[PDB]
Amino acid sequence: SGFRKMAFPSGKVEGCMVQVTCGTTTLNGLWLDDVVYCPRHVICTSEDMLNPNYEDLLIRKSNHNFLVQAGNVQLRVIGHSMQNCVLKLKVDTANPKTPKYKFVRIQPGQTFSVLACYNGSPSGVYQCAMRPNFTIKGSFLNGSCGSVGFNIDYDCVSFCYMHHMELPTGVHAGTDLEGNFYGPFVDRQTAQAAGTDTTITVNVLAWLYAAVINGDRWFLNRFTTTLNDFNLVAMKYNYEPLTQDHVDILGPLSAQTGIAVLDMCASLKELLQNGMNGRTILGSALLEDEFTPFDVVRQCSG
Amino acid sequence: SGFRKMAFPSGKVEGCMVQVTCGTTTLNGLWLDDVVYCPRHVICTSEDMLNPNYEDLLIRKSNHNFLVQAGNVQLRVIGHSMQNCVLKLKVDTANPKTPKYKFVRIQPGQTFSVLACYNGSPSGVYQCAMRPNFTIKGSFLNGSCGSVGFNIDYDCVSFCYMHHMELPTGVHAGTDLEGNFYGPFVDRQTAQAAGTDTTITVNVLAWLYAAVINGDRWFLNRFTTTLNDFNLVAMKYNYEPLTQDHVDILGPLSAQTGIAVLDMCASLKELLQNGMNGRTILGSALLEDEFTPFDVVRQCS
Numbered sequence A: 001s002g003f004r005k006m007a008f009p010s011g012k013v014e015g016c017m018v019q020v021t022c023g024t025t026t027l028n029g030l031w032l033d034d035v036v037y038c039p040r041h042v043i044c045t046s047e048d049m050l051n052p053n054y055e056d057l058l059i060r061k062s063n064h065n066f067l068v069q070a071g072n073v074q075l076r077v078i079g080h081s082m083q084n085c086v087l088k089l090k091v092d093t094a095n096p097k098t099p100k101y102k103f104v105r106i107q108p109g110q111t112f113s114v115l116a117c118y119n120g121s122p123s124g125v126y127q128c129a130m131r132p133n134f135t136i137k138g139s140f141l142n143g144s145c146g147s148v149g150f151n152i153d154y155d156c157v158s159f160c161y162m163h164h165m166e167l168p169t170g171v172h173a174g175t176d177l178e179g180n181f182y183g184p185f186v187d188r189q190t191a192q193a194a195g196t197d198t199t200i201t202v203n204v205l206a207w208l209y210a211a212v213i214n215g216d217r218w219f220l221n222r223f224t225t226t227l228n229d230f231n232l233v234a235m236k237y238n239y240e241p242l243t244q245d246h247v248d249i250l251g252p253l254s255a256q257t258g259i260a261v262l263d264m265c266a267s268l269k270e271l272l273q274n275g276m277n278g279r280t281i282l283g284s285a286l287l288e289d290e291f292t293p294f295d296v297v298r299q300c301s302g
Numbered sequence B: 001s002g003f004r005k006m007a008f009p010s011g012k013v014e015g016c017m018v019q020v021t022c023g024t025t026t027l028n029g030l031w032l033d034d035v036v037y038c039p040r041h042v043i044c045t046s047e048d049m050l051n052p053n054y055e056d057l058l059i060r061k062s063n064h065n066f067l068v069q070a071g072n073v074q075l076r077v078i079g080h081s082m083q084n085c086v087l088k089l090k091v092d093t094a095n096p097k098t099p100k101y102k103f104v105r106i107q108p109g110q111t112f113s114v115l116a117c118y119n120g121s122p123s124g125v126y127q128c129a130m131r132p133n134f135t136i137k138g139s140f141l142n143g144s145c146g147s148v149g150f151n152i153d154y155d156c157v158s159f160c161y162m163h164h165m166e167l168p169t170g171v172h173a174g175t176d177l178e179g180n181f182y183g184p185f186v187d188r189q190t191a192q193a194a195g196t197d198t199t200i201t202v203n204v205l206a207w208l209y210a211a212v213i214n215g216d217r218w219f220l221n222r223f224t225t226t227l228n229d230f231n232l233v234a235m236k237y238n239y240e241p242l243t244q245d246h247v248d249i250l251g252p253l254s255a256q257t258g259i260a261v262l263d264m265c266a267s268l269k270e271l272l273q274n275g276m277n278g279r280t281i282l283g284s285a286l287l288e289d290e291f292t293p294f295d296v297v298r299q300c301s
């Protein structure tokens, strides 16, 4: 029993984190085989960051202008190039701890583990979701840039996030490992803001299914609803629409608990309209939306 | 900025996890140098649960009755003994991935990371506290026994918890790495039950200081309190007493925010009386008590 915000074990990713310095800027990189991946803004100073021309800044740098440290050891940079908003530094030595991996782009609502690092040194791990507005609610100070997010899908690490920056509201923006931003952001010091966010409906239902499995039942009722009726209610409460794909995806949990998705939607309907009337669910007074269906199945079976 | 329940990177501990089998019972063990530590109930059968005589069960075992598997590889057990409620199995190979480590027994209120494991293979990592009633609120299925809790407060791993069992209320009980239980619990299936839990006052205050640091001020007031009056009120909401040790410990957060501890105590009284009236604090609609003073300093500045 018990239900907790749970991260993947971080060990395979710890053995890829390195420090990258360019000028007075130090941040984190990811060392896989003989390439180190990091945000391209490592090459910018304060003035440059205001309105950078990355192409122009890069061609002015020799290999030896990138200092790369793995633990106490220096790595020799032998080549450098750019892919979207990530810098790829070719190094002389392949990473002996390189795990089996892939680069994947995740969808809003999907979750992942973040290994926060400072000076190439991992400091903490936590679980995050990609919000509908393409931000993450992370925990990051200065020096965290280049920290990465991932899932482990077998023995294979799926890298999905590299941290670039913090927005003025204290939430976080970054890229996939091919350097494409999540959300309408750019790597420069200009005025940017998170769009208004919504709740991830399908995840809330998954978390309701988790609460049932752990013996929390008070919000079940005799009622059921349709997709459309429920969606009229969701839109009103700033919840994402629920689709047939969502319902299919919840099938396993529905079967295991004998609560049909639309029946559970009837419970969620009521919680939205009436509130929690003093009660909590899995220790929370708010509806949690940062666990996927798969996350629930994984923690309540695997 | 932001504020998150953050666990330590788990890799130094992943490198120490092994599978231990005795009869039909499989659970997790911790391989450090040439010793594997696991719960002693690995040697108990269907019968043994209610009233196990561990000394009697153990004397009947040889080394080769313990199968230990680290990844693909079997380790040869060359010795065994019992220390309190943990079995220590001597093996033929020192763990090459043994980190710098120590064993520490923690106090109620202290936090630590758990590596949940099944069949000696790590499954997930999360952050926990030792509750006042000496239980932890974890996430643990069958086969999780022998999973461990730890801190890493430099390059040194401090092992502080080994998981033994689930109580009927769905919370969790275990030992330090010298095999002494936290709380009055025993590795026996008798009726036993967690004492009523209280909130960890010192941690809630630390978390209030964290919300101030991150720019959140709405819950302060112009009042102060004595320590004693604060404790008389807190007890009525099932909060742990705050002691002078607690107050001293919060000094650095007090200095960093310019708010005296007893002033912050006044704010907590008011929050208990009023609740939050639709507001959140660092994203919570409840008062969080699973961050220590040390944890706040570590994540914030």
Ligand SMILES: C[C@H](c1ccccc1)N1CC(=O)N(c2cncc(Br)c2)C1=O
Pocket: A041, A140, A141, A142, A143, A144, A145, A164, A165, A166, A186, A187, A188, A189, A190, B001
């Ligand atoms: C200013 C710069 C930047 C601006 C725009 C685009 C890219 C970079 N940086 C650098 C830095 O370290 N962080 C940061 C990241 N996370 C948490 C915190 Br607090 C700070 C930034 O936002």
Ligand SMILES: C[C@H](c1ccccc1)N1CC(=O)N(c2cncc(Br)c2)C1=O
Pocket: A001, B041, B140, B141, B142, B143, B144, B145, B164, B165, B166, B186, B187, B188, B189
């Ligand atoms: C029955 C036995 C035991 C009882 C009392 C004392 C010692 C052992 N086990 C074995 C087992 O795996 N767990 C367990 C641990 N965490 C979560 C869950 Br669900 C189950 C137990 O309580």
